[PDB]
């Protein structure tokens, strides 16, 4: 019927000592095909061969493994060979392999230590997938600050995915910030700081409330101060709030105080409730030359004379840009044969939507000037029938192309944001294409989701067959994760548009979720597009913590419960939250584990490898135009399928026209006994097939919060991070 078709997709950045998946698609007559990938280290001699049988219209994905390499980072020649009984094809490129470093991190039993105490910490190691990995670590040490390292452990091997250590600090230790440093085989190092100093345990914390973001058009401001105590009960006393504007006209050096205008309010923190106060920002001179807002509240608790300070809303943003509208679903691309609809949000200042407010949408290079209005949610869905030139510029405004009040006086700080956006059309030699309407947004996890697809088939299959097909891939973590297909009995000879796609969002997908879909046409033609779902930062192995409840009076009998995989381990850190009431911990959450990951999202081919140029030069003697006049030559600027897969992060070998037929340049040239506080529990526990349940010992005279951090690990489900049960 038509030309036979093959297609191999593989990432550009390959990791070693592990598995990585690559997909292959095959179809159309002389199907006894055998595909083989050969990754070879050019300099010297290295070769990793892989084979696979290939049949009709199947998108099979094989997971090849790569072991460690001599060097750290290195390029390699990947050559794919397709052999059909009567056909042959071979194509290669430069794949970048990297002896990636594992993601290791430290967690301490405390954030601040006092003399004579033992620092207890845990070292965790992992891979891209969060399945725990056992490993021989060359070095881990505690360092004193002068470079007078305080302790050191060499060559220990992780077994349960983590290891706990302890070091007793002396009675007269050096004061300041100390540090735990771990060094991996690859030469990599990781630092986790911690401090050592003297301190009194606080039985209360001040908590104030002021607008997180204060702007220009503000005449007054709400202020409030409330103090949490033992069991969060109210505390009576005195309060002195120092709301201030910082960096004044003073020079700020040796005789001039950097401190700008300050307002000191004195309040009598009553028995029940908390204190409030309405201030006026007239004295702050919230205008052009003056700087930001620091609010140092100082609460003085009675019968102790204990004063404690808190630094709040330093970054209240007196933004010259007001009525800063928005966008939401602004498509980055379009087509010369489709009505694209962009959803735009409009907000102002702090982040509150503005309802029923007239706005103007201007579409240049398409001549689409229209009015609209902000609804209850400040959302507007504007559609534009696209039959126009290459690039379309779209802007939206509520004011006009100038700052309405005193723009160019050199002494003003007022502005209005202007929605600006540019969009390019895709290339389509077949004049047919696909475009997904995405739920481009904060995608949830552990849930299903449907994305809709629009296919405009200009004649569709010229001759071909009746069944046409679409193949989709949801790739993640600079790799891949899920794949699938779909097809349809095409209409006889028209451009049918609607069809949806369903995908689960269980896990195994980075914050980013890059979804692409491409439909193949037996005439040696293909079309496709991408999409972005910012997955919510959630983990694979579900995990949770509970406890036989809060009860006063040291009655040892108390419980803690943890739910995780049916065969796992769990690091439990129950901390008497007194030092934690004072200073916080260090980024312990799912988002932390995620950002510690190497290259969260792979976009664009890495640095060293440049590209895979072609040779199809279409330069005519002259551009060959008959009519008004002749025309010169010039390069184009539009998105392309090859660019879709490039921004996607991967590479592929095919035969069909993927890249735009770019021309070669011009050749021509010239009852109680106090126990140990500031902690509660710090240990490992085994998880049976029904959830673990430990019986903790309720301790005396320690009335503060009790943050319970649960860090579980299972070889099958991965890690887990569950909340801080505060058995107060």
């Amino acid at each position: 019927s038509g030309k036979p078709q093959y297609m191999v997709l593989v990432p550009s950045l390959l990791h070693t000592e592990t598995t990585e998946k690559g997909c292959v698609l095959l179809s159309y007559l002389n199907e006894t095909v055998t595909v083989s990938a050969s990754l070879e280290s050019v300099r010297g001699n290295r070769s990793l061969f892989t084979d696979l049988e290939a049949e009709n219209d199947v998108l099979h994905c094989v997971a090849f493994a790569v072991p460690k390499s001599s060097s750290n980072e290195e390029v390699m020649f990947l050559t794919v060979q397709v052999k059909g009984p009567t056909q042959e094809f071979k194509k290669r490129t430069t794949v970048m392999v990297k002896n990636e470093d594992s993601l290791v991190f430290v967690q301490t039993d405390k954030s601040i230590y006092k003399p004579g105490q033992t620092v207890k910490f845990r070292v965790v190691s992992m891979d891209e997938n969060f399945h725990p990995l056992n490993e021989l670590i060359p070095l881990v040490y505690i360092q004193d600050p002068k470079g007078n390292r305080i302790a050191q452990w060499q060559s220990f091997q992780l077994e349960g995915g983590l290891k706990q250590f302890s070091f007793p600090l002396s009675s007269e230790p050096f004061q300041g910030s100390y540090k735990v440093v771990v060094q991996k085989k690859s030469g990599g190092r990781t630092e986790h700081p911690f401090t050592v100093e003297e301190f009194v345990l606080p039985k209360f914390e001040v908590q104030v409330t002021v607008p997180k973001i204060i702007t220009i058009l503000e005449e007054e401001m709400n202020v409030s101060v409330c103090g949490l105590y033992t069991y969060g009960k109210p505390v009576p006393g005195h309060v002195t709030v120092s709301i201030c504007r910082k960096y004044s006209d003073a020079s700020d050096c040796h005789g001039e105080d950097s401190q700008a205008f300050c307002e000191k309010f004195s309040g009598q923190l009553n028995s029940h409730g908390c204190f409030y106060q309405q201030v006026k920002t007239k004295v702050f001179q919230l205008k052009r030359k003056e700087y930001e807002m620091k609010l140092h509240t100082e609460a003085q608790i009675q019968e102790e004379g204990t004063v404690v300070e808190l630094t709040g809303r330093q970054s209240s943003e007196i933004t010259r840009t007001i009525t800063k509208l928005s966008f939401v679903k602004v498509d980055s691309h379009f087509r010369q044969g489709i009505p694209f609809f962009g959803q735009v949000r409009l907000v102002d200042g702090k982040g509150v939507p503005i309802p029923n407010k007239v706005i103007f949408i201007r579409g240049n290079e398409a001549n689409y000037y229209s009015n609209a209005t902000t609804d209850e949610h400040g959302l507007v869905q504007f559609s534009i029938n696209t039959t126009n030139v290459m690039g379309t510029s779209l802007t939206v405004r509520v004011n006009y192309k100038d700052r309405s009040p005193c723009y160019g006086y050199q002494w003003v700080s007022e502005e209005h944001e202007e929605a600006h956006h540019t969009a390019y059309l895709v290339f389509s030699p077949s004049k047919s294409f696909v475009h997904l309407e995405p739920m481009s947004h904060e995608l949830p996890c552990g849930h299903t989701q449907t994305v809709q697809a629009h296919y405009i088939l200009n004649g569709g299959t010229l001759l071909g067959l009746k069944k046409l097909s679409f193949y989709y891939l949801i790739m993640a973590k600079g790799g891949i994760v899920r794949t699938g297909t779909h097809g349809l009995l095409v209409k006889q000879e028209d451009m049918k548009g609607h069809f949806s796609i369903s995908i689960p969002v269980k896990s195994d997908i980075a914050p980013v979720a890059r979804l692409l879909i491409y439909a193949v046409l037996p005439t040696g033609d293909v079309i496709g597009d991408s999409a972005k779902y910012d997955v919510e930062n959630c983990l694979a192995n579900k995990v949770d913590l509970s406890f036989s409840p809060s009860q006063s009076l040291p009655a040892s009998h108390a419980h803690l419960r943890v739910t995780a995989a049916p065969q796992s381990v769990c690091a439990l850190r129950a901390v008497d939250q007194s030092v934690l009431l004072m200073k916080p911990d260090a980024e312990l959450s799912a988002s932390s584990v995620y950002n510690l990951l190497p290259e969260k999202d792979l976009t664009g081919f890495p640095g060293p490898l440049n590209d895979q140029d072609n040779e199809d030069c279409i330069n005519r003697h002259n551009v060959y135009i008959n009519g008004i006049t002749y025309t010169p030559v010039s390069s184009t600027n539009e998105k392309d399928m090859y660019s879709f897969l490039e921004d996607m992060g991967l590479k592929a070998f095919t035969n069909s026209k993927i890249r735009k037929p770019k021309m070669c340049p011009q050749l021509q040239q010239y009852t109680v006994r106090k126990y140990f506080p500031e902690t509660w529990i710090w240990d490992l526990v085994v998880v049976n097939s029904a959830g673990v349940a430990e019986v903790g010992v309720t301790v005396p005279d320690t009335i503060t919060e009790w943050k319970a951090g649960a860090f579980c690990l299972s070889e099958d489900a991965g890690l887990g991070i569950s909340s801080t049960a505060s058995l107060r």
């Binding site: 070879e40 050019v42 390029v75 020649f77 194509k91 430069t94 040779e615």
Partner: protein, 295 residues
């Protein structure tokens, strides 16, 4: 570099001139580095702007030269590796390398700019580096060489000399002793043998309207091609034979007789490869240890 090799192989060398040449090598090396591309390619100007694209032949020349320089002085392997991957990128699955023409003058290049000849010069520069024939690039290149030689052999004309000569050298480096002897026989058939030596010219006189003087678009490349034939004859896996050495001696006599009083030869390419061939001939025949021959 090849001058240094000639002197060291002939033993006519002193440390003074050696140091002088070493300084020259380092200087010219860095000056060449001042013209590369960000990717690793090379061009006439290149650096200080990115409104250009590199050349292939020049990159191959730089590669070969840097290899020999590495043999004597120290150099960075990263540059040769980058140039290598660049050439591979400019290669085709079936076809050979493309001539990304960005040169200033064709005099420096001792070739006819044909894609076959270009690809042949490239692959020989690659094989000059110790590279396994099972390697991908050389595999595809060898396919190009085999196909090109087949079409030029069955056909009455495939330029009749330059191509076949370079092809012979490439085949010699690969290991196809049979193909080597076959193409070598084809070359020997069209001999320009003289009174006490032998050589090969272009098609005896260019057929189409040609000439006027100054070697316009045709540098004559006779010394270089003859030296290429020499280097081919001198290559074998165990050690060369006797017959090849006799023919080598003949062409070597022609070569030394063709030298220029001003110095070197007619151009740069020929002087380079000629001295290369003479150096290898010295490494094979001349021996500083063998000093008791009795005839």
């Amino acid at each position: 570099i090849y001058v240094l090799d000639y002197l060291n192989e002939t033993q006519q060398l002193t440390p003074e001139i050696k140091s002088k040449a070493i300084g020259y090598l380092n200087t010219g090396y860095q000056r060449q580095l001042n013209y590369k591309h960000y990717d690793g390619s090379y061009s006439t100007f290149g650096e200080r702007y990115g409104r250009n694209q590199g050349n292939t032949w020049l990159t191959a020349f730089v590669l070969k030269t840097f290899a020999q320089a590495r043999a004597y002085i120290f150099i960075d392997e990263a540059h040769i590796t980058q140039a290598l991957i660049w050439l591979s990128q400019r290669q085709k699955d079936n076809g050979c390398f493309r001539s990304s023409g960005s040169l200033l003058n064709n005099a420096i290049k001792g070739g006819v700019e044909d894609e076959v000849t270009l690809s042949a010069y490239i692959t020989i520069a690659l094989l000059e580096i110790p590279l396994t024939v099972t390697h991908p690039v050389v595999r595809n290149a060898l396919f190009c060489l085999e196909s090109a030689w087949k079409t030029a052999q069955e056909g009455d004309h495939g330029s009749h000399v330059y191509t076949k000569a370079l092809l012979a050298y490439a085949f010699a480096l690969a290991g196809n002793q049979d193909k080597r002897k076959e193409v070598l026989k084809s070359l020997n058939e069209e001999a320009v043998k003289k009174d006490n030596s032998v050589h090969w010219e272009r098609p005896q006189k260019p057929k189409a309207p040609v000439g006027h003087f100054y070697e316009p678009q045709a540098p004559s490349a006779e010394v270089e091609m003859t030296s290429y034939v020499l280097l081919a004859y001198l290559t074998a896996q165990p050690a060369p034979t006797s017959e090849d050495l006799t023919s080598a001696t003949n062409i070597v006599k022609w070569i030394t007789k063709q030298q220029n009083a001003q110095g070197g030869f007619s151009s740069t390419q020929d002087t380079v490869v000629a001295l290369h061939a003479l150096s290898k001939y010295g490494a094979a025949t001349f021996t500083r240890t063998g000093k008791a021959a009795q005839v």
